[PDB]
């Protein structure tokens with residue numbers, strides 16, 4: 001064990017105990033906030049500030065949540081993507097805070113902490129879990145433990161909670177800007193931006209700031225800051241080296257039904273001729289269209305569009321829905337679409 005922790009930004013070498021990442025008070029305040037086949041996500045408090053902790057078992061031979069554990073080599077591309085996107089908050093020509101911030105990454109060894117099992121149980125009793133109770137791991141088990149800034153609540157879970165379609169406009173504008181900046185900087189495609197992967201949190205900032213190819217602009221917040229998550233299918237590049245998930249031989253991804261989400265996977269494959277290493281930023285437009293579609297058809301707002309000014313916003317979002325598929329990229333949308341003028 002002769003690697004440094006957290007990409008060289010932690011002085012420990014080799015695996016660390018859970019207690020390195022979750023000292024007793026941080027551990028005691030963990031509450032589970034979500035899950036997937038990968039493992040578990042908890043919210044806790046560090047220095048009076050909420051954070052999210054995502055815990056993924058790696059390198060072992062046996063099944064977790066019905067699937068084999070990834071190796072570190074298998075997970076590394078997504079760690080790289082997460083970090084590159086987070087680093088856009090501190091860049092100059094192409095700058096955005098719209099991707100989830102990555103605080104730290106550790107490789108942890110040990111059995112699962114009993115205090116996290118308690119939090120897992122509470123979630124299972126209240127919301128119900130699709131996962132195995134993570135109490136079967138042995139003292140040799142390795143995990144990747146990622147600490148993200150806390151991003152809030154997902155858009156699907158906020159289906160009935162947003163003020164108005166003005167809020168929807170801000171959300172769409174924030175998403176479009178973040179995707180554009182990542183296109184410009186990293187030739188980035190998200191490739192899986194369903195409404196579970198858009199987070200919303202309160203902000204006291206009235207305007208949010210971004211920079212696209214050296215040009216800075218602002219977006220009225222409507223009191224919310226958007227964060228994009230989930231890079232399972234994402235693609236980007238740096239100095240000509242491409243990191244992407246190769247789904248060219250996957251079958252089931254393209255046979256979904258019952259939501260426009262599942263059409264987007266098929267429409268992506270059409271656009272790229274099943275060649276997933278290429279750059280097709282139209283996929284970002286496809287996802288933004290799916291999101292706009294959710295805003296207009298599945299979201300319900302606390303205040304409807306009662307005045308002609310608000311009815312006009314609604315009409316303009318309907319016009320965005322009808323016209324946006326004729327743009328080539330999130331960059332094209334941001335720079336050219338009337339909605340964002």
Ligand SMILES: CN1CCCN(C)C(=O)COc2cc(ccc2OCC(=O)NC2CCCC2)Nc2ncnc3[nH]cc(c23)C1
Pocket residue numbers: 033034035036041052054056075078079082100146148149150151152153154196197199229230231
């Ligand atoms: C609980 N959480 C939904 C859980 C289920 N779900 C949809 C995911 O997991 C999607 O992916 C991410 C989720 C979060 C953060 C980063 C993710 O992606 C990058 C990544 O993990 N890279 C890793 C690099 C190596 C492998 C993956 N989750 C959150 N982060 C911050 N605040 C939050 N509030 C609400 C949530 C949340 C939603």
Ligand code: NA
Pocket residue numbers: 089097098099100101227
């Ligand atoms: Na962020």
Ligand SMILES: [Zn+2]
Pocket residue numbers: 005006010011012020106
């Ligand atoms: Zn550390």
